[PDB]
Structure formats: C-alpha cells, structure tokens
Design a protein around this nucleic acid. Structure first.
Length: 1364
RNA sequence: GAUGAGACGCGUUUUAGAGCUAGAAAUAGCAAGUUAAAAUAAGGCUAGUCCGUUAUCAACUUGAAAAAGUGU
C-alpha cells in the first residue's frame, strides 16, 4: 500500500528504510536467481549500502600535467634536431641515432657504444677536455675558433632541454633580480601592510649582508643586527629566515593553537601557506610572495658567484668554479683523512651503503645527509678549518645539478644560447638563417588561456584554430586564434554563484566586492556616546562619511582612528564606545588604494560612471597572466591614461575569485522598497540588516527571487546536477548512490512512488584530533577570562585542559567560581550537589550547549516563571553578568538570554526563531539533494502550467533523530555493526512523517518546493495552553518534539501532561500512539536481519609502485618498456590488481605434459586489464591455460561476497586475501546496556532518571557475560580465530571484578574482532590482540558467490562448487 | 567546494666517462667520482607539440554506444 522512504546519506554509507503508515517496516519475499536450490528469501525493507570513499582528481591532474611537460620538452629537442638534421648529415651520419640508443646495452645497440663521436679516442679527449657540459658551453661562448657542430648541438640542446623558469617577465635586470631591490620591495609591502610602527630601511646594504658567504643563522642574525627595533623571532625576522631557507614558525606571531612551520624548499610548502593564509587572511599573500622572490634572488646570487670581471657566460663559469672548488676540497679531504684517520677509509669512499662520499655520488644520499654524516668526522680531526665554514654555508663538494637550480631564470640560458649562435653565426650560415627559430624554441611558452594544443579529441582543451596545420612555436601567433581561445577560456574559467545561477562571479579583488564587504562589516557597528545610554546602529550618512573619510584614505582602519578622526573631529564626540568591531576593520579597500597608487587620480576613482570600466580592468587583470592578451584588452583604455601609469597598470596582477555576483549585490531589487542589497547595506533605517539577513528575511522579495531563479532552464543530466553541487567527490558519490537506492526501492514497490522521502545528511563524528582542540580553546578562554577579571582562581585551584571536559567544572571556572543567580561562592568539592540549569527551558528549545547552560546550587533560584530567569534575579545579577560578558566568559547571545525578562520575556519572534532554528536546514548541499530527488520524483503536470507534486521531499536535521534516540533510549553504538545507518534512516522516516502529519502548515520549512510561507502569529499562541482543541494554535511551547513525550517538565518543576494519543487539530488524524508506536519503533530496531551491502568496485589507478628498482634476475619485475628486459634494464614491482577472475581450464603438469582440469582464481592487473578485456581466451592461453570455458569465466571485483558453511561469509579483498563478511546482530537490550554502562559518568541528565539509569546498569551485571557469550558463539561460527578468542576470554576472566563501565568500554573495543571488513588489531585492557588475517583464498572457489543489488533485496546466487 | 590551464628543478633507472699495479687464483694496495644521453606510468588511435592513475561499475537479457528492460 502507501509507504515512505527514509535516507541517511554519508560519504562511506547510505542508510535506507521503507515505512508504512503505522511506522512499520514491511517484510517481503524476493525471488532468488542463480543455480542454487534457493528460489526465495524473506527480507526486511531496511538496510545500508557501504562503499569506499570517492577520490579527488588532484593526483591524476599532477600526473597529467607532468606527462604534458615531458612530451613538450622532448618535442622541443625534436625541433632542434629537425633544424640540425640536414647539415648534420654532412658532418656525422649516426650522431642522433647514437644519441637515441644511449639507454640500450651494447648488445641491443646496433651502433658504437660511444655516443658523441662514435670512437673511444675523441670521446676520451672530449670528456677530459670538458668534464661538464658547462665547460663546453663556456668555451662556445668564449671561442672565436671553429667548433664541431655536434658539440654546438650538445650545448644548444642542453640549454633547451633544461631552459629554466619563466617567473620573470621581460629582459633580465637588477630591478627584478638583485637582492637589494627585492628586499626594498619586501619592506615596502611590509610597511604598506602595517604603516603603524613600520620598519624603514634606506641605509641598509641588503646585498652585502644577505649574499655574503656565511651560515644561515649567522646571516639572519647579521641582518637583525642592522635592525635594533626588530628581532630574529619577530614576524619580519621569520620572513627573512624563510627567505634564507630556514624553517621559521609563525605560531607565536599569531598566537595560533597549532604550530605552523614553513619551508620554501619543502614540497609541502604551498598547501601550508594556503592554510596559514586561510587563518590570517589573503592580505599577507603578497608578503610571503615577496619573501619567495627574495629567496630565489638570494639563491641565484649564491650560484652566480663568478661576478669577478663579469665576462663570458657567468652561469657556466660559476658552475666551472664550483667544479674546481669541489676538486680542491675533495683532494684536500682525502689527504686529511688518509693522513689522520687511516681506518674506516673504505666506509667513506667505497661502501656507499651508509651514506659516505660514495653514497653521495653513486648512492641515494642528499647533500644534507652527506653533510650530516661527515660533520663529526671533520669535528674529530685537526686542520679541518675552512672546510667547515663551507659546509655550514651549504657549499661543500656541491654538484652542478641540484635542487637550487630552480631559481635560474630562462633569460640566462637565452643569453648563452644567443652568444653561442652569434659566435658560430658566420661559420655556419644556417645558424644565421635559423637563429630566431632556435631562440624562439627556447623562449616560447604556452599561455594559460590557450591550453592544450588539441584538435577536438581532448576533454581538457578549448582553444580555437584559425587554420588547419601543425602548431609550431614559430607559426603559433598566426595559426592560433588567441581572441576566440581567450574568450572560450573566459567562459570556462568563470564560475557561477551558488546563490544565483546564470550570473558570473566577480573577482576577489573587485571594487564593488570590496565595497560590499566593507559596508557589510560597517553596517553591524553600534556606537554609544555620553548621554543616550542606548546602543545605536550607524546611519547611512555616518556610514558614507566613514567610508569616504577613512576607508578611502587608509588601507587599515582601527577603532582608535575611527573615534579620534571621525567622532571627535566631525561629530564632536569626546567619548565613544563601539561593540560592532574589535581592534580594526577586517575588510579593506585594497584595490582602491592600489589603483590610487598606480594612476594617481582620486576623482576618477569615485565617478560612478567609470565603475564598469574599472571592473573590466580588474576582471582582465584577474583572468590573465600573459602580457600580450593583457595589452590587447587594455588597448581600449589607452586614451584614458598613458606612459608610466599604463605600463605599471599592466604590471599589476590579481588572483582569486569571490562567491557573489554583481546582479546579487546590486542588481535584484525589492518590489516594495526599491532598494538593492548594497542599498540596504548602506541605508536601512534604525535596524541594520546584513547580507545573510536579507537572504533570510521573508518580508522582502529577495528570498523568492533567489529561489525562483535556482532552477536552470531545460533539464540536463543527473551527472551534471551532481557535478554542479558544492561538496567533495565522496559525498557526490554518496548522493548518486542515494538516488539509485531510491530508484530501486520504488521499483520494488511495484513502481509506486512514496508519499514522503525523508533525508538526513549524516554528521562526521569527532576525529578526536579536535578533541584536544576544544579543550585547548576552552582553556585559553578560561585563562584570558581570568587575566581580564583578576581573580587568581587558577592559583588556588590549578587545572589542566583534560579535567576541563567536565560540564559542571567548566561552568564553575566560566562563572568565576560563583553562583549565577545567587551572590555566593560555589563549593569546589561539592559540585555533585549543584545543578546545571537551562537559561531557555527545554520545553521551548532543545539547546544543551554551554551557550544556554548555567551552574547553581539550586535551579529554584531562576524563579517562578516558566520563562527566562525572573526580573528579580536579573536586576540583582545584571552587573556580574555584564562583568562576565566583557571578560569573554560568556557570549553576547547568552547575556541576551539571561537578561530577557528585563525586556518583557520570551516573545513570539523568539519562539518563531526557535522553531526555525530546530526545523530548517542551513546546509545548501542538502537543499540541492532534496531538489534533485524532487525533480526526479515529480514530473507530472496538469491542464495549466502548474507542477504536480505527488512526492514530498522532507529535509531533517540530525539533531532531531539524535535527541529522539537519547530521550526514549533508542541508543546508538557504532562499534557493534553497520546497522546504525539503516536505523538512522528508519528513525528519520518516522520522525519526518510524524512531523508532516502533526504540522502540515509548517511544510514550507522542511519540504522542498514553492509553498505558502505563513507567518508567526497563526502558529504560536499568545499565552498559556488556553482552550485545547478550541483554537487554531499549534503549540504554545516552541519545541516541536514535545508531542512524542508523555510528560513535559518545565523550568519550575511543574509537570504538564500530554494525551496518550497525539492527533492533528485540523484534519483529526492520529499522528502518534505513545504505546504501540514506540513499541513498533523498538521492535524495528530490534530486528536482526538488516540488508548490509558493500559496493563491489574494480580497482583503478597507477599500474604499480612508482619506485624504479635496479636490474635483477627475478622475473617478477615489470618492464619499463616492452623492449627493455628487466633483467638488463630493471623495472617496476608490486602490481595492482584491478579485479580477480574465475577460470576453469586445464594445464600442463609433469614431464609428460599431461593435462589436469583446474579451477583457479587469477588476478588481472590494471595494466593487463585492457589486454584481458580485449580478448580473454587468448590472454589466458598466453598465461598458460588450455581449453578455457568462455561461459564460466567469472568477473570478481573487490569485496565480492561469498557464503560458506553455517552462514559464514567472506569478502574478496584481493587474489590472495579475504575479509570478514558477517554482521553481528546484538539485541537492543545489550546495546542500551553497553551505552548506559559506557556513558555512566557523562549522563548529562536530570538526577532522577540518571540514578535510575545507574541502578539499571548495576542490576544487569549478567549482561556482560551474556554479551561475551554472544561474541564467543558468533566468533566460533564465522570469524574462526581460536587464539584471539582464547586470549580475550581469559583476559575477560581476569578482570571480572573490575568496574562495569571500563569493562563495557573494553567490550566495545572487543567488538573489533567481529566487525565487518578487514581484520584490525585492537586493545582489550592490558592485552593487545593482533589481526588474524585470512591469507587462504581457495575455499572461495567452492563457496556460494552472492551477487547483490544496491539494496541487497535482489540476489543472484551462484554455487561455484557446481562449476568444474 | 569542487573542476581546469602554463612552467621549472630534483629524484630514479640503463649506458657513455678506457681504472692503474701486483698474485696460480682467491684476494689485496691505490688512482678517480661533480657530467651527459635516454626513459619517466606499459601504451592508445583519433596521429593531436592529443589522450593514458578522477568520476563511473551487482547479475541476466537487448544494444556499437548513451541506455532500456527482467523478480507478487
């Protein structure tokens, strides 16, 4: 008949349940396909799908870009060879051929083993004359003599293959390369960022200090010595340390809880910098960027040491000098070692396995490791001066190819290449003819806006061709339609506003955006002068004055500058108090002051006609990074400004994107008011509404406008709808799975669509890493509050962050060790006698946070009202609460709630606020999921153009079902099994349907669609529970979940009574039977047969481990190339199995080669997958199988389920390992007992029920033994781990007299033995139980393979024993 | 809150850099090392200075494929 679906969506699981009108879960008979004797199964319509997390596309992206880079570099070399070919043919016939076959061994090499000249003599002569390529290069730059064309090619190819970075635009100059200028730019950025107590550096000689050859710390200290006002541990000092190559910690600089260390050389610098910036804002971005630039400058100056006469080729010459110095230091070192320390000489120069010099050259030992190894050796010997000063400076026995070379610009290599081409120009005419060609090969770089040079068959490419010919670096300008390509690039890179589609998002550094956020922060500011004694929000004229006078004059605006230079100067206000903002304004007009600094025309910046122009400029500077396209898009504004300001404007760059569009900020308009969002921000009368409040407020047309615009025109794919969502690929996977689950479920019900689909987005439980974070935050809160107040409670009563987890103790320190309602001190060691009271009663709102809790000796002190605490207490305690407020012991809202009786008490607006707080879902992703399901379910229409909604999609908060569990003892213990997902889905269905039955008029709150909004008057009564069933009022008490309860305890202690049967007032429908329905729910939760399905997946990804192992005679290794034998060349190891396969055939055995029929489980690697799926029989026959049955070849992905004896189940993890496949179903009584036993001390409830719960735990001690018996039988049946079971049984016997709480906790830990999935090690008391793995996989070959549908309701069971 | 475009430098693996002197070998004494080529998922056809590690995937039937169907 009629039914509804409950859903619990997660990132690794999807819970689902089908309920009837009586809140019951149907049990149905399902057909069983396959080849067994089972043709039918009885199943409950409840279950949960399990699956591995979806992965982000980052790794794939990195790999892809890397491949493109390798390809394009190789293509550059091919261009060079293409130019050199014809003239090389006259010089050497097999030069390039010999170069190509360099990797091959002499056996597979058709030509001479000697690459360059083909004969050993010229090769030896060459290598002796030039021990590095830089020698040859430096010669080719400095020799007028005719040179061999082959060596010329070697130089050019070396310069092209490793061409250097493109971080610097234009010609190389000291302004953007020298240490001094970049240091000045750095301190300029610093002073710009601060301007209050800034550092001024004019006399300083940054080059002489930073570029000097000394140790890092001493260089840092030497720079610090020139700055008396700043210190090494300061922010600037840490920046310098960062630029030098150290690892500074910025934790102390910002008082962050977690230490934040940054190292530029470290590969993980970027995401760390992004985290830090995420914490402190993107204003400091340019600062760290300047630090990076300075670092590159210092490194580049450190390598280019040969600045003696500045002749020739400085880079190559410097590498030469490094070679010479290396030789000298080496021979000197060998001399010293041989002289003083004859022993262990072999370990240093021959062993190489323990990071010696031989390990430094022939082994995998870095420079820092080599330094670390030889440091004590140098310390022990004498005459080791000079070698150590070079070692500490990281310039001892350096190689020419190191990690430092990243700082080398391409302009240098361009210089040497131009030089060489110029030197050999007249000798070889084709160098003169093809000079610009080679130079173009080195200098050409594909722009971001052009992308992959594809021709239609690339998923990632978008570029447009103005011709049909192969793109080269030389004809790129005349073949690539840069305009259309840039346009497509723009269309792709512009994301759309999540709030408002069909509207492009503005840049993060847009002027209108900065105006928006500035006014948004400014509108929430209240000021109190001397006389009015009441807080007043800023008026429109005041806001405009503040913006124009302050925000358009300074980058940073502080409260002191605000009161001093505005209120006192213009408003003539001597004393002012501000609550809205803290120390300064977080928002700023950065772009405004940037452009002001650039063009130096202030009036032009304030013309409202030039807004679109400036926005266009900012958009252009945000989108592109290439100089030419920027010049093209800024050519229209050439008449506006010229010369210096134009170039400087083109040099300016912006990065980042906002979240909002222009049409949202200052486009859509309220019908009645005629004011946009920004207009409301600037002027809104007495009360000032922020952005989120205008979106929220239903009194305006904005919410309607945002909603009606959400659906894009036409209907696209499901995949696109999911892709458009704002969430991780994991939750998107979960969403898709959820949709499919709904489809199968409605198929099961004879294609009848449900009345309701209730949705919950499962919350991620504490990762415990934040479990220390909360204690740290509350601890810091306590210390700051104490330091502010001045009561040395921490002295007389010392505490640590661990003990502060207790509610009453935390409140004790929060309340200055004083009673909240009474003027008396609290008893430190009698907190058990003390009660925790709610400021807003549970009858009105379910808020158990610290925000709504107080500690007092008796909650009778709150007074006689069923409301907030009385006025008689507020008037008395207002001062103390005001002292606790400004000391940050409590929040503003808590103070507002404590002093609500002074303002009349609770109101209809407050109660409505409570209802909206309980019933509405803030998460956007959930609303979008509900939108998807609604769109998929309802597709019928009528005669008019009206949408018929047959299926209602209800959205629920997790708090409702969670509190539902806690209030009526339907307790959850995740460690037992995976049933709790399904259970959560069921309870969601129940609560959702109950709520839609009880309050149909509140449909607009949870249900997706365009409904009658309704108001606050019709829902909430004026006062009391007046006239039952004689009024239209739905509820006087603002808590929606009260009708489930039999009794309602107010803040007085008075017990209100509710009927045994709850019914709707308007339609006279029974919504809840407090006996039978709770009995039904408990019965459902007690059912042992729940459909748990693990999604089977083919493994995808890299072929194997990426480490290239050296050559060995083993045949296990995989060839790097099909021609390259691993025995001679080496290869990869540890392949990854995509899936396994079941094969029945025959093989050759013995000398007689007799065929024996076999049934085996073969693993198909990801590499082998293509070949196997292309033609399986030939693949298997090549593998060695004979007479294969193509029909019986069975695909077995990971987590393939098999059933064996006595209902024992195993999942296929790999070709050679299994996982546990069974779920231990534990009775509800044991679950509740375990919860109550574990949650013994932390009950957090009223004493009456709590004591009864304690007694409930104590009375049922036998439950421990019963549970152990359950686990024992279950393990003996399906786990089969006798040793571990014996160990945990004995360990259980040892601690029988132990307290029930810890014992129950250890049983909860013990559940890991029986958990579904891969075996894991767990700790039981003192005993540690290691995993009992299932290494054997043969039993599967004769078990029953179970093919499960997504819900598990449809089964296809294959008895593999019958196959053979 | 996901998805994308450009580029650099290491790393690793083979080969090229002739090891020299004794001793029947076994094994001993030293001389030197810094660089380069090439590969960097095997590969694919659509042959692009493109694509190849994300997403997606129970079984069966029908389809080249998107996708439809099959079970009170």
């Amino acid at each position: 008949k009629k039914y509804s679906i409950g859903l619990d969506i997660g990132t690794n699981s999807v819970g689902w349940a089908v309920i009837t009108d009586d809140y019951k879960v149907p049990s149905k008979k399902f057909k069983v396909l396959g080849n067994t004797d089972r043709h039918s199964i009885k199943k409950n319509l409840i279950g949960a799908l399990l699956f591995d997390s979806g992965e982000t596309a980052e790794a794939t992206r990195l790999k892809r870009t890397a491949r493109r880079r390798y390809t394009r570099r190789k293509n550059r070399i091919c261009y060079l060879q293409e130019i050199f070919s014809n003239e090389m043919a006259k010089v050497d016939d097999s030069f390039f051929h010999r170069l190509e076959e360099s990797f091959l061994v002499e056996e597979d090499k058709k030509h001479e083993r000697h690459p360059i000249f083909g004969n050993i003599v010229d090769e030896v002569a060459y290598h002796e004359k030039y021990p590095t390529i830089y020698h040859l290069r430096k010669k080719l730059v400095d020799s007028t003599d005719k040179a061999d064309l082959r060596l010329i090619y070697l130089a050019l190819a070396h310069m092209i293959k490793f061409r250097g970075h493109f971080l610097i635009e234009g010609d190389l100059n000291p302004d953007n390369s020298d240490v001094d200028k970049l240091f000045i730019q750095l301190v300029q950025t610093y002073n710009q960022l601060f301007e209050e107590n800034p550092i001024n550096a004019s006399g300083v000689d940054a080059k002489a200090i930073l570029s000097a050859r000394l140790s890092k710390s001493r260089r840092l200290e030497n720079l610090i010595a020139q700055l008396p006002g700043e210190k090494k541990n300061g922010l600037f000092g840490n920046l310098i340390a960062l630029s030098l190559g150290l690892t500074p910690n910025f934790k102390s600089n910002f008082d962050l809880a977690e230490d934040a260390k940054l190292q530029l050389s470290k590969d993980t610098y970027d995401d760390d910098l992004d985290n830090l910036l995420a914490q402190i804002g993107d204003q400091y971005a340019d600062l760290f960027l300047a630090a990076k630039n300075l670092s590159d400058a210092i490194l580049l100056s450190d390598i280019l040491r040969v600045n003696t006469e500045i002749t020739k080729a400085p880079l190559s010459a410097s590498m030469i000098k490094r070679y010479d110095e290396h030789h000298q230091d080496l021979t000197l070192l060998k001399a010293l070692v041989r002289q003083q320390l004859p022993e262990k000489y072999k370990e240093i120069f021959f062993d190489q396995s323990k990071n010696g010099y031989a390990g430094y050259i022939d082994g995998g030992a870095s420079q820092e490791e080599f330094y670390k190894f030889i440091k004590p050796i140098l310390e022990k010997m004498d005459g080791t001066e000079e070698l150590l000063v070079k070692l500490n400076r990281e310039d001892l026995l350096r190689k020419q190819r190191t990690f430092d070379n990243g700082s080398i610009p391409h302009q240098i290599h361009l210089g040497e290449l131009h030089a060489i081409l110029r030197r050999q120009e007249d000798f070889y005419p084709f160098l003169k003819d093809n000079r610009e060609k080679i130079e173009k090969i080195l200098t050409f770089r594909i722009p971001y806006y052009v992308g992959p040079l594809a021709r239609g068959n690339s998923r990632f490419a978008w570029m447009t061709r103005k011709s049909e010919e192969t793109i080269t670096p030389w004809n790129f300008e005349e073949v690539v339609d840069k305009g259309a390509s840039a346009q497509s690039f723009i269309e792709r890179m512009t994301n759309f506003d999540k709030n408002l589609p069909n509207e492009k998002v503005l840049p993060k550094h847009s002027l209108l955006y900065e105006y928006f956020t500035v006014y948004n922060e400014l509108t929430k500011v209240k000021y109190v002068t001397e006389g009015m004694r009441k807080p007043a929000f800023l008026s429109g004229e005041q806001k405009k004055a503040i913006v124009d006078l302050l925000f358009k004059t300074n980058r940073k605006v502080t409260v002191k500058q605000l009161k001093e230079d505005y209120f006192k100067k213009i408003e003539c206000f001597d004393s002012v108090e501000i609550s809205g903002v803290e120390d300064r304004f977080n928002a700023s007009l950065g772009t405004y002051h940037d452009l002001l600094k650039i063009i130096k025309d202030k009036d032009f910046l304030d013309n409202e006609e030039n807004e679109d122009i400036l926005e266009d400029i900012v958009l252009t500077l945000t989108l592109f990074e290439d100089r030419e396209m920027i010049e093209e898009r800024l050519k229209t504004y050439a008449h506006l400004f010229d010369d210096k300001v134009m170039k400087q404007l083109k040099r300016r760059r912006y990065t980042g994107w906002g979240r909002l569009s222009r049409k949202l900020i200052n486009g859509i308009r309220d019908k009645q008011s005629g004011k946009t969002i920004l207009d409301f921000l600037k002027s809104d009368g007495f009360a000032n509404r922020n952005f989120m409040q205008l979106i929220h407020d239903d009194s305006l047309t904005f919410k309607e406008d945002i909603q009606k615009a959400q659906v894009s025109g036409q209907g696209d794919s499901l995949h696109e709808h999911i892709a458009n969502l704002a969430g991780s690929p994991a939750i998107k996977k979960g969403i898709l799975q959820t949709v499919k689950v709904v489809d199968e479920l409605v198929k099961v019900m004879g294609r009848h669509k449900p009345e309701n689909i209730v949705i919950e987005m499962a919350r991620e439980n504490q990762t415990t890493q934040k479990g220390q974070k909360n204690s740290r935050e509350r601890m810091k809160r306590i210390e700051e509050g104490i330091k502010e107040l001045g009561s040395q409670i921490l002295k007389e009563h010392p505490v640590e962050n661990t003990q502060l987890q207790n509610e009453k103790l935390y409140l004790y320190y929060l309340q200055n060790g004083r009673d909240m309602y009474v003027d008396q001190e609290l008893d430190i060691n009698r907190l058990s006698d003390y009660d925790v009271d709610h400021i807003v009663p549970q009858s009105f709102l379910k808020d158990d946070s610290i925000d709504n809790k107080v500690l007092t000796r008796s909650d009778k002190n709150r007074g006689k009202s069923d409301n907030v605490p009385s006025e008689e207490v507020v008037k008395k305690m207002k001062n103390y609460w005001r002292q606790l407020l400004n000391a940050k012991l409590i929040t503003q809202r808590k103070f507002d709630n404590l002093t609500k009786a002074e303002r009349g008490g609770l109101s209809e607006l407050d109660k409505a606020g409570f209802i909206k707080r309980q019933l509405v879902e803030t998460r956007q992703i959930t609303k979008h999921v509900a939108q998807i399901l609604d769109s998929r379910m309802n597709t019928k229409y009528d005669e008019n153009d009206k949408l018929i909604r047959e299926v209602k999609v209800i959205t629920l908060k997790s708090k409702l079902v969670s509190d539902f569990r806690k209030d009526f003892q339907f307790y959850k213990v995740r460690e037992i099994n995976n049933y709790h997902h399904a259970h959560d889905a069921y309870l969601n269905a129940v609560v959702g349907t109950a709520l839609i039955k009880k309050y149909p008029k509140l449909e607009s709150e949870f249900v997706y669609g365009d409904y009658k909004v309704y108001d606050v008057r019709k829902m909430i009564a004026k006062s009391e529970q007046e006239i039952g069933k004689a009024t239209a009022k739905y509820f006087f008490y603002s808590n929606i979940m009260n009708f489930f309860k039999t009794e309602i305890t107010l803040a007085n202690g008075e017990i209100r009574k509710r009927p045994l049967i709850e019914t709707n007032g308007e339609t006279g429908e029974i919504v809840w039977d407090k006996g039978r329905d709770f009995a039904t729910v408990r019965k459902v939760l007690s059912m042992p047969q729940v459909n748990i399905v693990k999604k089977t997946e083919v493994q995808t990804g890299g072929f194997s481990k990426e480490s290239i192992l050296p050559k060995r005679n083993s045949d296990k290794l995989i060839a790097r190339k099909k021609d390259w034998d691993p025995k001679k060349y080496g290869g990869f190891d540890s392949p990854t199995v995509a899936y396994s396969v079941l094969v029945v055939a025959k093989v050759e055995k013995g000398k007689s080669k007799k065929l024996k029929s076999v049934k085996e489980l073969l693993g198909i690697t990801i590499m082998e997958r293509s070949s196997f799926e292309k033609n399986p029989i030939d693949f298997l026959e090549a593998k060695g199988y004979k007479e294969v049955k193509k029909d019986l070849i069975i695909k077995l992905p990971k987590y393939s389920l098999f059933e064996l004896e006595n209902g024992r189940k195993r999942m296929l993890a790999s070709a050679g390992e299994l996982q546990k496949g069974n779920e231990l179903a534990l009775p509800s009584k044991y679950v509740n007992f375990l919860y109550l036993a574990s949650h013994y001390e932390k009950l957090k409830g009223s004493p009456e029920d709590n004591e009864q719960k304690q007694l409930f735990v104590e009375q049922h001690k036998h439950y421990l033994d019963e549970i152990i018996e359950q686990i024992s039988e279950f393990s003996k049946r399906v786990i089969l781990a006798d040793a571990n079971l014996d160990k945990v049984l004995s360990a259980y016997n040892k601690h029988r007299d132990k307290p029930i709480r810890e014992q129950a906790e250890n049983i909860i830990h013990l559940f890991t033995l029986t958990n579904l999935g891969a075996p894991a090690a767990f700790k039981y008391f003192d005993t540690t139980i290691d995993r009992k793995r299932y290494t054997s996989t043969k039993e599967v070959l004769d078990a029953t393979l179970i093919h499960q549908s997504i819900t598990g309701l449809y089964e296809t069971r294959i008895d593999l024993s019958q196959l053979g």
